[PDB]
Amino acid sequence: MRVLIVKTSSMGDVLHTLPALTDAQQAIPGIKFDWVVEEGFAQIPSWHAAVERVIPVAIRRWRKAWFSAPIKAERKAFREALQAKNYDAVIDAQGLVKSAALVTRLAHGVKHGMDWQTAREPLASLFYNRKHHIAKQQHAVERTRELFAKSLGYSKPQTQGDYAIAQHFLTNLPTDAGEYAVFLHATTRDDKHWPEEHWRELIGLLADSGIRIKLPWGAPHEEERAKRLAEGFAYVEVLPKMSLEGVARVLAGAKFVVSVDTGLSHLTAALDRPNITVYGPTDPGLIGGYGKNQMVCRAPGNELSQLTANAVKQFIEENAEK
Ligand SMILES: Nc1ncnc2c1ncn2[C@@H]1O[C@H](COP(=O)(O)OP(=O)(O)O[C@@H]2O[C@H]([C@@H](O)CO)[C@@H](O)[C@H](O)[C@H]2F)[C@@H](O)[C@H]1O
Secondary structure (H helix, E strand, O other), rough: EEEEEEOOOOHHHHHOOOHHHHHHHOOOOEEEEOOOHHHHHHHHHHHHOEEEEEEEEEEHHOOOOOOOOOHHHHHHHHHHHHOEEOEEEEEEOOOOHHHHOHHHEEEEEOOEEEEOOOOOOOOHHHHEEEEEOOOOOOOOOHHHHHHHHHHHHOOOOOOOOOOOHHHHOOOOOOOEEEEOOEEEEEOOOOOOOHHHHHHHHHHOOHHHOOOOOOOOEOHHHHHHHHHHHHOOOOOOEEOOOHHHHHHHHHHOOOOEEEEEEEEEHHHHHHOOEEHHHHHHOOOOOHOOOOOOOOEEEHHHHHHHOOHHHHHHHHHHHHHHHH
């Protein structure tokens, strides 16, 4: 059986879809998935055993120079690749009008998606052949598992979702796996960042433990902050710039992670690595992670400026308890 998945945007949303592929694979041996996803996250689906062909899209990038000669070419290659196969099922796990009109609508096969009252954008429900009712009051990971279960004729396992992508890294874990912690400081908005000052204090509190700390960074200004956070700390290392897969191998070898509400935090949860995510303006109840050893840390008065290094270290300790 060959199924096509439409789940493009948000590294987090993409990662949350994995447990659903694990359920399907266990229930239906031989099942394989093709997956339409934003190029920036195209490596993620490849890490899962049930994933066959990845079909990248780069909306935002394209969208800005949409009629260009080179772009016109990419969009053409995309449509053709998208329509290449006749799927036994097309599952729109995105629930957006834009993705249903730009992707789902064009694929061959019975199209499944959420119904009018459960879809991210009600109107997208009109684009499906099969509309399923997926209760909103539950984690995104479970909602997608329910969607896959109902779309593919099998009952969702009572067990916790298994992202099943850690094994992709187990074979080539860093030599110093378990010897360090990874602090994910970079994110999309200022108010979501934990003040540099607190980061350095946390780091300082760990000085005599003998642990080492690695700092990822995806953009120049993020590298500069990482340099600032590392200064004077011989046991802290600013990572070189790497791919999603590369930073994913580093996370896999991390003993634990402290992070702000960002995609790499979601990657961490998918890799089953103990993780303490610190939230401020964003609510962990609505967008929290999912998985083993994930611990929520809400900043006082939803202001990260109020969260102390001491408080975060305490969570690390009690996250170790479990
Ligand atoms: N290979 C790589 N190595 C090191 N860093 C990498 C990287 N790739 C990306 N980043 C960095 O990761 C961050 C991505 O930004 P983000 O805003 O935190 O992205 P994301 O969409 O993943 O964050 C999500 O943002 C949502 C909203 O706040 C608005 O998008 C939250 O609800 C959700 O929980 C949270 F995960 C950026 O700083 C980016 O440079």
